Amino acid sequence: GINPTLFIAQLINFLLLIFILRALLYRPVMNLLNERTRRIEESVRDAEKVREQLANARRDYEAEIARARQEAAKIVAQAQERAKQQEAEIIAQARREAERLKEEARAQAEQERIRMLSEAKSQIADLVTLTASRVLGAELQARGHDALIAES
Amino acid sequence: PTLFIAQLINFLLLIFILRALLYRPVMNLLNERTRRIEESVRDAEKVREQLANARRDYEAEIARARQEAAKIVAQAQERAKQQEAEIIAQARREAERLKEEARAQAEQERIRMLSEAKSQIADLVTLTASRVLGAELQARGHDALIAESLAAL
Amino acid sequence: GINPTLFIAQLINFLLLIFILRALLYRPVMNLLNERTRRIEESVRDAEKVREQLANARRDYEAEIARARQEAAKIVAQAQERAKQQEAEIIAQARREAERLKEEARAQAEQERIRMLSEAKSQIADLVTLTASRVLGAELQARGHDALIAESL
Amino acid sequence: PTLFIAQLINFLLLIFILRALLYRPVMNLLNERTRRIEESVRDAEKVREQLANARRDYEAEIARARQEAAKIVAQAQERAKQQEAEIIAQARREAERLKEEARAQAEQERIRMLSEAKSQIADLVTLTASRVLGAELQARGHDALIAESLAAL
Amino acid sequence: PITNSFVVAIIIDIFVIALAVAATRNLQMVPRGLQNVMEFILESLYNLFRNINAKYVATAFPLVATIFLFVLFGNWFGLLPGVGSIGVCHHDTCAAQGKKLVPLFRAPAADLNFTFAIAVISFVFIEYWGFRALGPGYLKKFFNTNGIMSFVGIIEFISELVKPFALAFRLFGNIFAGEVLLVVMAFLVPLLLPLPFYGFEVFVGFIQALIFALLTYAFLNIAV
Amino acid sequence: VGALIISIASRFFLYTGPPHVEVAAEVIFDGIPGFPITNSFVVAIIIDIFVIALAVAATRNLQMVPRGLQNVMEFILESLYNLFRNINAKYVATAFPLVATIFLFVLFGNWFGLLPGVGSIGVCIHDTCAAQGKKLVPLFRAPAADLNFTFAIAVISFVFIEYWGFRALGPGYLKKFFNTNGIMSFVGIIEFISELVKPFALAFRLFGNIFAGEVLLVVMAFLVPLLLPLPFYGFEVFVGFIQALIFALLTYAFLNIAVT
Amino acid sequence: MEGLNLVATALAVGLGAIGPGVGIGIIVSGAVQAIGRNPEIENRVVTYMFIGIAFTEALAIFGLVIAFLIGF
Amino acid sequence: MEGLNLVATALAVGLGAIGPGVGIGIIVSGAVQAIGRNPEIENRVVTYMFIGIAFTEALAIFGLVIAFLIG
Amino acid sequence: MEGLNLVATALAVGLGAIGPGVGIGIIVSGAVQAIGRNPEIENRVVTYMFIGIAFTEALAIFGLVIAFLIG
Amino acid sequence: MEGLNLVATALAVGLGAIGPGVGIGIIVSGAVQAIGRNPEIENRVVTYMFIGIAFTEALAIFGLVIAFLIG
Amino acid sequence: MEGLNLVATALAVGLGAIGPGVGIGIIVSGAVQAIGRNPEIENRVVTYMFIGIAFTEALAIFGLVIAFLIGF
Amino acid sequence: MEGLNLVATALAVGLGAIGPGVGIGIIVSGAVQAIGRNPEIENRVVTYMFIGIAFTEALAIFGLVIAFLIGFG
Amino acid sequence: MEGLNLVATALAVGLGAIGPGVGIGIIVSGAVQAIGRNPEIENRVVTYMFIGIAFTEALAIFGLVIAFL
Amino acid sequence: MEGLNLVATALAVGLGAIGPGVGIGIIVSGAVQAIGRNPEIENRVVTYMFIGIAFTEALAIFGLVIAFLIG
Amino acid sequence: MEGLNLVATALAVGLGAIGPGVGIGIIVSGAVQAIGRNPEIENRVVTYMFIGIAFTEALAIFGLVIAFLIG
Amino acid sequence: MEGLNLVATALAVGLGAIGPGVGIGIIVSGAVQAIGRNPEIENRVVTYMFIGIAFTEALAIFGLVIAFLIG
């Protein structure tokens, strides 16, 4: 109970359905494959973004470190220049003082010695006090001796 | 026939009755699978957004680094001002100490010269007195020491 | 062949054989097995008891030796106590003898003091001769003084 | 019929085959069981004999230890008596030594008292001679011959 | 003209192109609707096709995948009750004045050619690939290869030839199994008796389509 | 020796000389008023006497040292005593000789079956008694072939099972009786039916086994003169020894079953 | 013959259920063994547990139905 | 062949009782072998155990009912 | 013929005892290995053995009733 | 029918013996294998062996009694 | 004799399928225990699980087809 | 049907023992399997070995003896 | 009579099929155990399983073709 | 009905051979499996190898001899 | 009978096919499981497997040629 | 009826060969299982393998010659 004509008709219908289905679904299979495979490019982009963020963080840290180093170097240079100028000024002032004050002290000592040497009235008063001091006192000398005054 | 219709109706009813109860969990599973595929798509979109905004994140990091640089420069300026002020103050203090020491040394030199002059004047007065003591003794007579020597006995 | 009489006869024969075996075969075999098991158990128990008996004999010998030693030590201690008492009695007798010796020494001292009374008989004349001996050339007489000798001390 | 003859021939052949192989192993197994039973019986007999001899030896050792303890106790009593005698003898010897020492010390004390009394009498005689002769030489013995004696040269 | 079974050969065949067109219209990431759960099994079948061989996933996939996809609905098509309960006429509905009551509302896969149509398409394409890949090696006699070991190639090639014939027959028998089982509970009971295994048979028919797809994968596996 | 195996002497009155079958289900000696004598039952008394004679010899001159039959019977009895103790020592000594009496009689019965020449032995090809006009009443029928004797033993075993059943939960045997609910009721009823069948089974078990060796020996004799039966007889002798051991073992197993 | 259809009807029905009756007997036997070891892959292995049962039970219906083609 | 129905009647009754009768034997043997293994998933797989028993017992039903159709 | 009913009596009883005669053998063998492994779940698991025969023994008695009906 | 009952009697006994005869092979061999694995458990596991045997042995005897009844 | 094909048309289907109705159960349950240790290996196993089943069920087909080649 | 009883007496003798003809080998195997693993229980398990041997063989004798009712009345 | 050939047709088909109907099932399941053991020798043994299939399945079709003759 | 004895001969020939003809391999397989278990013990293991063979080889010849009687 | 030889033709072809149809399956799968466990001694096994195959394949051809002569 | 001997020819040739023929596989499968673990005992068990073959094939070729003896 098998009809070759009916068998041929059924085979033709099945073959036409299969060919049409293959032609229609060749595109859909590739579409689904691309939709699934987009995640691979997504992961590649995510890895690239992570690498870029890490590079940006490293660059920011390096910039902060370099800025801190330059700031410290500038502060150190300014402090060193200020200290050098201060030390030079202090040394110059100390030298000027030790020179001028000492020279003026020596000159004033010499002048005061000369004036006191000129101020022999106290030395004359000293000789007057020395007169009759337990000698030429109760028994005074014969008219004294002006030579000591002459010596003075 | 009537029996065939009844059998077909009962089979369809049983099929639907089983299908609803089975499809409840099956609809849950299908919704879970759709949600998983949508979550994969959302992860793809988030990765793309992160890749796009990497430039903005780098700009923000560069801005933070520039702000840190400005803060470091301000701290350097403040430290330089403080160190310069400390150096100037120390220099002024040392100069004042040196000037006070110089003035004190000058005054002490004046005092020492005065004291040395006083001692030298005392010595010279004794010498000048001795220079005329012999002449005074010769003029007034030396028998007083002989009288003094006798008074010693 | 479903004859019941033959079945009954066979059953009777089997029952009689079983009774005979219980009387003859089963009883002697059970007796022999029980005797063998009892002999084995008795041998094990006897070995354990023999080891225990040897250990107990050694322990008893040691204990008898210890008891004898304890009794001997008690006898020795009693003898030592008696000897100590005798030695104390001897020491007391020695102390009494020493006291008697001291008393005899005191009596001898008293006898010596009594003999010192003979000095009046002798030492008076001994001194009188000694005074003559003291007088070089034997002056004595007028040069001597018997009253001073009579004065004595 | 010949069936019985054939059956007998087959039975004889089977018996010969069985005796060829099974007889040796069955005999070996029976001999092994008999040997095990005999070994167990000999072990039980030896254990019983050992237990009996051990009880006998324990009694004998108890008797020997009792005899040794009795000998020890007798030796203890004899040593106690001997030590009591020795202690009494040592005490008597020490007492005799003390008594002899007392007698010797008494003789020494008598001699010492005699010597001490002699020395005291001599000192008294010397003192009395000094008193009397000095009194005698003062006036009674006062003669110029004293200077002549001093002038011996 | 042709038989009612050959007439029924386009009831699902038209929908087969329509479903693939719907599959072409509905195929995207996270597709909800026509491509939600069926494509997941299809991808698993593609994974199963990948589990067979990477080449087998595309060597004759157009010659294989559509038929299994069609028979998946075709298995569901057979499970439909009441189709033919009244005679179509080419005291029952058509018992009186019988016009042979040829019902076109019947499973065309029940025809052995319809099973053989998918079977021959996969078998020949595998054989053509087998001709391309092995050819003579597919039926390599290997005369006295290992001391008269030539029977390996001859028997297997006959068995392999029998296998494509059996595969068409087995699917036809499986198709006939459901058709026979359709009236099994019909005269037995008037209600709900066929439901005990009709869905299971449909699942088995769905498995049979998968088995045919597996056989297509297996034939490629044999071709590999 | 070597390849001297010929054994071609079979063709000597092997087929024409021996009868075709000449077998029977049972043989009765009869010739006695009241109870009819049976050649199997007569052999059983002879078997019982020989077993008693074996028992008498070991019992006579009994000594502590095991030797000869005393040593042989000991290890024979001890293993069975050990086996029963290994099986179930709760009531092993309760009926230890009873199983042994079953064991020894069957072992004697197997030995009785091993006795040759009983076939042609019989009073009235043609043979002698069959050649004679009177019916060839065969002599020395197999005592073990008496299925009634096995049935009597099985009934006694069933009685022994019943006596154990009388001990099994006392007179209760409730699990053996029935169960109230659950599947245990159907199984227990089946088991009780199975237990009842089990006594009848053992009797049928040994009876066919006993009859088999006699059938096999006759069959072998009708087939071959002497060669095949000798290999065949040893198998039956081992089988008879096994079945004898198996017989009381099943009773012990029934006792072990009744122990539960 | 008069009952030759009837014995043929009892032929396929009685016969066909045997092997498939054993076949399902085999399947679930080792299945519970597999599920008993791993209760978690139950959902994975019960899936393949019944696909054979789908085959195996169906085979017994073949001669069952064919004998019903002799039943009436 | 007047009793041809009768021999037909008892034909399938004993036949179909064999394989499923074996089949229940196989399943419960494997089931019980795993029930002692897994008393935990027991209550889950006791239901699994009776799944094939229902399948096999239904097969034994088919032979008996058609016998009553003939008997 | 005549013994067609009589041979029918032989059929189901003769056939039916086989599969259960195997199937009962299968379970207890598998049970004992499970029982030997787990004698603690034994009471819980031999219940399945006790109900396992009930799934099968009832099948074996299908022809026995019918045989007596033909009896 | 010229000894049809003779044929009929000679079937069921030969039929219902192979199955149970197999079933004995299953249980005890599986039991001994378990007992070989587990010498410890021997009290109720061995009992489970014999209760199935009694269930198994009875199956082979169903038609054997009925054989001589028709016989 | 009369209608001799009646038993014949029911013969092979009852016989020729039960053995195949067993081997699949062996195929399945053996695989079930095999896959019961590795579930994900089904990709290589389930594909080989059905190739024999295809051969096995093909034997079951033979009883069905000749039941009408002789049946008609 | 001149050979019908001859057929009948040859019916159950072929059958019946097949299962025991197989089951004994199973009984042999697993026991032999068991003693290979467990040689120490051999003094106790070989007892269990012959338990089913009697069970198998006893049913196997039925095909012989009962068929002799057919062969010999 | 008049159907013995028709009887003979279903004879070998129903009989011989179960051999491979079981034997191949043992082979395949045994192969699955072997594949479950290792798929490394799968190239050798799946072919060797097919070798046994060629050994077995060929026997199964012996009576099928003969019955048509 | 000629040849009815000739077929009657072949009855026990085929059936009586397959049963024992299977168990022997099981005896062989069980032994050879245990040979690999422990070749250490061979005198008291392979002893059991031929124990079942006598229960098996001789069992088959039961129908062999009675069939020749028909012959 | 007119088809008795025709029936006799179909017996042995159907009959003997099961043995090698199963025994070789046992030969193959037993070896396949063995070879699958270890293919090292496979070449020895395959030769010994072919030894078993040859001991069984020839049995399948015993009545195969014989039937064609009668045919 | 002019062909029962021809039928009986296929009986003894067919039947009695499946069992032993399968039993060869049991020997073979059991061997390769043991062969799969030990080649040194192999030469000791090649004879033991030949023990089974001699036990198997001898019974196998019983009815083959017997069929010609009565054919």
CSV table of N, CA, C and O in Angstrom, one decimal, chain A residues 57-111:
chain,number,residue,atom,x,y,z
A,57,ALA,N,45.8,56.0,36.8
A,57,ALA,CA,46.1,56.0,38.3
A,57,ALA,C,47.6,56.1,38.5
A,57,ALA,O,48.1,56.9,39.4
A,58,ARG,N,48.4,55.3,37.8
A,58,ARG,CA,49.8,55.3,37.9
A,58,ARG,C,50.4,56.7,37.5
A,58,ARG,O,51.3,57.2,38.2
A,59,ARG,N,49.9,57.3,36.4
A,59,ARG,CA,50.3,58.6,36.0
A,59,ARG,C,50.0,59.6,37.0
A,59,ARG,O,50.8,60.5,37.3
A,60,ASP,N,48.8,59.6,37.6
A,60,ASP,CA,48.4,60.5,38.6
A,60,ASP,C,49.3,60.4,39.8
A,60,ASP,O,49.8,61.4,40.4
A,61,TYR,N,49.6,59.2,40.3
A,61,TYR,CA,50.5,59.0,41.4
A,61,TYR,C,51.9,59.5,41.1
A,61,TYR,O,52.5,60.1,42.0
A,62,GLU,N,52.4,59.2,39.9
A,62,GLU,CA,53.7,59.7,39.5
A,62,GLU,C,53.8,61.2,39.5
A,62,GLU,O,54.8,61.8,39.9
A,63,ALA,N,52.7,61.8,38.9
A,63,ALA,CA,52.7,63.3,38.9
A,63,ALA,C,52.6,63.9,40.3
A,63,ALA,O,53.3,64.9,40.6
A,64,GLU,N,51.9,63.3,41.2
A,64,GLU,CA,51.8,63.7,42.6
A,64,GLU,C,53.2,63.6,43.3
A,64,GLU,O,53.7,64.5,44.0
A,65,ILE,N,53.9,62.5,43.0
A,65,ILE,CA,55.2,62.2,43.6
A,65,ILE,C,56.2,63.2,43.1
A,65,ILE,O,57.0,63.8,43.8
A,66,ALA,N,56.2,63.5,41.8
A,66,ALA,CA,57.1,64.4,41.1
A,66,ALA,C,56.9,65.8,41.6
A,66,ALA,O,57.8,66.6,41.8
A,67,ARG,N,55.6,66.2,41.8
A,67,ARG,CA,55.3,67.5,42.3
A,67,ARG,C,55.7,67.7,43.7
A,67,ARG,O,56.2,68.7,44.1
A,68,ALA,N,55.5,66.7,44.5
A,68,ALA,CA,56.0,66.7,45.9
A,68,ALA,C,57.5,66.8,46.0
A,68,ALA,O,58.1,67.6,46.8
A,69,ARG,N,58.2,66.1,45.1
A,69,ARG,CA,59.7,66.1,45.0
A,69,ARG,C,60.2,67.5,44.6
A,69,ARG,O,61.1,68.1,45.2
A,70,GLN,N,59.5,68.1,43.6
A,70,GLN,CA,59.9,69.4,43.1
A,70,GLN,C,59.6,70.5,44.2
A,70,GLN,O,60.4,71.4,44.4
A,71,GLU,N,58.5,70.3,44.9
A,71,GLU,CA,58.1,71.3,46.0
A,71,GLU,C,59.2,71.2,47.1
A,71,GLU,O,59.6,72.2,47.6
A,72,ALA,N,59.6,70.0,47.5
A,72,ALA,CA,60.6,69.8,48.5
A,72,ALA,C,61.9,70.4,48.1
A,72,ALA,O,62.6,71.0,48.9
A,73,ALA,N,62.3,70.2,46.8
A,73,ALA,CA,63.5,70.7,46.3
A,73,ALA,C,63.5,72.2,46.3
A,73,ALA,O,64.5,72.9,46.6
A,74,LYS,N,62.4,72.8,45.9
A,74,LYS,CA,62.3,74.3,45.9
A,74,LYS,C,62.4,74.8,47.3
A,74,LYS,O,63.0,75.9,47.5
A,75,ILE,N,61.7,74.2,48.2
A,75,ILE,CA,61.7,74.6,49.6
A,75,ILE,C,63.1,74.5,50.2
A,75,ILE,O,63.6,75.4,50.9
A,76,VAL,N,63.8,73.4,49.9
A,76,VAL,CA,65.2,73.2,50.4
A,76,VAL,C,66.1,74.3,49.8
A,76,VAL,O,67.0,74.8,50.5
A,77,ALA,N,66.0,74.5,48.5
A,77,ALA,CA,66.8,75.5,47.8
A,77,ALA,C,66.6,76.9,48.4
A,77,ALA,O,67.5,77.7,48.7
A,78,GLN,N,65.3,77.3,48.7
A,78,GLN,CA,65.0,78.6,49.3
A,78,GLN,C,65.6,78.7,50.7
A,78,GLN,O,66.1,79.7,51.1
A,79,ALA,N,65.4,77.6,51.5
A,79,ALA,CA,65.9,77.6,52.8
A,79,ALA,C,67.5,77.7,52.8
A,79,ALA,O,68.0,78.4,53.7
A,80,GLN,N,68.1,77.0,51.9
A,80,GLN,CA,69.6,77.0,51.8
A,80,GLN,C,70.0,78.4,51.4
A,80,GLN,O,71.0,78.9,52.0
A,81,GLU,N,69.4,79.1,50.5
A,81,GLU,CA,69.7,80.4,50.1
A,81,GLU,C,69.6,81.4,51.2
A,81,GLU,O,70.4,82.2,51.5
A,82,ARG,N,68.4,81.3,51.9
A,82,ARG,CA,68.2,82.2,53.1
A,82,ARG,C,69.3,81.9,54.2
A,82,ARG,O,69.8,82.9,54.7
A,83,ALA,N,69.6,80.7,54.4
A,83,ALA,CA,70.6,80.4,55.4
A,83,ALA,C,72.0,80.9,55.0
A,83,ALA,O,72.7,81.4,55.9
A,84,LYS,N,72.3,80.7,53.8
A,84,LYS,CA,73.6,81.2,53.3
A,84,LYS,C,73.7,82.7,53.4
A,84,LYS,O,74.7,83.3,53.9
A,85,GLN,N,72.6,83.4,53.0
A,85,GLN,CA,72.6,84.9,53.1
A,85,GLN,C,72.7,85.3,54.6
A,85,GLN,O,73.4,86.2,54.9
A,86,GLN,N,72.0,84.6,55.4
A,86,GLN,CA,72.0,84.9,56.9
A,86,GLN,C,73.3,84.7,57.5
A,86,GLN,O,73.8,85.5,58.3
A,87,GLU,N,74.0,83.6,57.1
A,87,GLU,CA,75.3,83.3,57.6
A,87,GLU,C,76.3,84.3,57.2
A,87,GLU,O,77.2,84.7,57.9
A,88,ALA,N,76.3,84.7,55.9
A,88,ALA,CA,77.2,85.7,55.4
A,88,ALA,C,77.0,87.0,56.1
A,88,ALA,O,78.0,87.7,56.5
A,89,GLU,N,75.7,87.4,56.3
A,89,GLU,CA,75.5,88.7,57.0
A,89,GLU,C,75.9,88.6,58.4
A,89,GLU,O,76.5,89.6,59.0
A,90,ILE,N,75.7,87.5,59.1
A,90,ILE,CA,76.1,87.3,60.5
A,90,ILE,C,77.6,87.4,60.6
A,90,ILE,O,78.2,88.0,61.5
A,91,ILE,N,78.3,86.7,59.7
A,91,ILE,CA,79.8,86.7,59.7
A,91,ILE,C,80.3,88.1,59.4
A,91,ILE,O,81.3,88.5,60.1
A,92,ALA,N,79.7,88.8,58.5
A,92,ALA,CA,80.2,90.2,58.2
A,92,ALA,C,80.0,91.1,59.4
A,92,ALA,O,80.8,91.9,59.7
A,93,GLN,N,78.8,91.0,60.0
A,93,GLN,CA,78.5,91.8,61.2
A,93,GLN,C,79.5,91.5,62.4
A,93,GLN,O,79.9,92.4,63.0
A,94,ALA,N,79.7,90.2,62.6
A,94,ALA,CA,80.7,89.8,63.6
A,94,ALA,C,82.1,90.3,63.4
A,94,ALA,O,82.7,90.8,64.3
A,95,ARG,N,82.5,90.2,62.1
A,95,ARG,CA,83.8,90.7,61.8
A,95,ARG,C,83.9,92.2,62.0
A,95,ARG,O,84.9,92.7,62.5
A,96,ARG,N,82.9,92.9,61.5
A,96,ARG,CA,82.8,94.4,61.6
A,96,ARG,C,82.8,94.8,63.1
A,96,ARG,O,83.5,95.7,63.5
A,97,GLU,N,82.1,94.1,63.9
A,97,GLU,CA,82.0,94.4,65.3
A,97,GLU,C,83.4,94.1,66.0
A,97,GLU,O,84.0,95.0,66.6
A,98,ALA,N,83.9,92.9,65.7
A,98,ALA,CA,85.2,92.6,66.4
A,98,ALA,C,86.3,93.5,65.9
A,98,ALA,O,87.3,93.6,66.6
A,99,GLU,N,86.2,94.1,64.7
A,99,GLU,CA,87.2,95.0,64.3
A,99,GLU,C,87.0,96.4,64.9
A,99,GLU,O,87.9,96.9,65.6
A,100,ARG,N,85.9,97.0,64.6
A,100,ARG,CA,85.6,98.4,65.0
A,100,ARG,C,85.6,98.6,66.5
A,100,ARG,O,86.2,99.5,67.0
A,101,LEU,N,84.8,97.7,67.2
A,101,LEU,CA,84.7,97.8,68.6
A,101,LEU,C,86.0,97.6,69.3
A,101,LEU,O,86.4,98.4,70.2
A,102,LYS,N,86.8,96.7,68.9
A,102,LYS,CA,88.1,96.5,69.5
A,102,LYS,C,89.1,97.6,69.2
A,102,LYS,O,89.8,98.1,70.1
A,103,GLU,N,89.1,98.1,68.0
A,103,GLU,CA,89.9,99.3,67.7
A,103,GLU,C,89.5,100.5,68.4
A,103,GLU,O,90.4,101.2,69.0
A,104,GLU,N,88.2,100.8,68.6
A,104,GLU,CA,87.8,101.9,69.3
A,104,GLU,C,88.1,101.7,70.8
A,104,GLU,O,88.4,102.7,71.5
A,105,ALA,N,88.0,100.5,71.3
A,105,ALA,CA,88.3,100.2,72.7
A,105,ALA,C,89.8,100.5,73.0
A,105,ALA,O,90.2,101.1,74.0
A,106,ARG,N,90.7,100.0,72.1
A,106,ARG,CA,92.1,100.3,72.2
A,106,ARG,C,92.4,101.8,72.2
A,106,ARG,O,93.2,102.3,73.0
A,107,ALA,N,91.8,102.5,71.2
A,107,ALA,CA,92.0,103.9,71.1
A,107,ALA,C,91.5,104.7,72.3
A,107,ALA,O,92.2,105.6,72.8
A,108,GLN,N,90.3,104.3,72.8
A,108,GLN,CA,89.8,104.9,74.0
A,108,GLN,C,90.6,104.6,75.2
A,108,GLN,O,90.8,105.5,76.1
A,109,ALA,N,91.1,103.4,75.4
A,109,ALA,CA,92.0,103.1,76.5
A,109,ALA,C,93.3,103.9,76.4
A,109,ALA,O,93.7,104.4,77.4
A,110,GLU,N,93.9,104.1,75.2
A,110,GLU,CA,95.1,104.9,75.1
A,110,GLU,C,94.8,106.4,75.4
A,110,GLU,O,95.5,107.0,76.1
A,111,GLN,N,93.6,106.9,74.9
A,111,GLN,CA,93.3,108.3,75.2
A,111,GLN,C,93.0,108.5,76.7
A,111,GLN,O,93.4,109.5,77.3
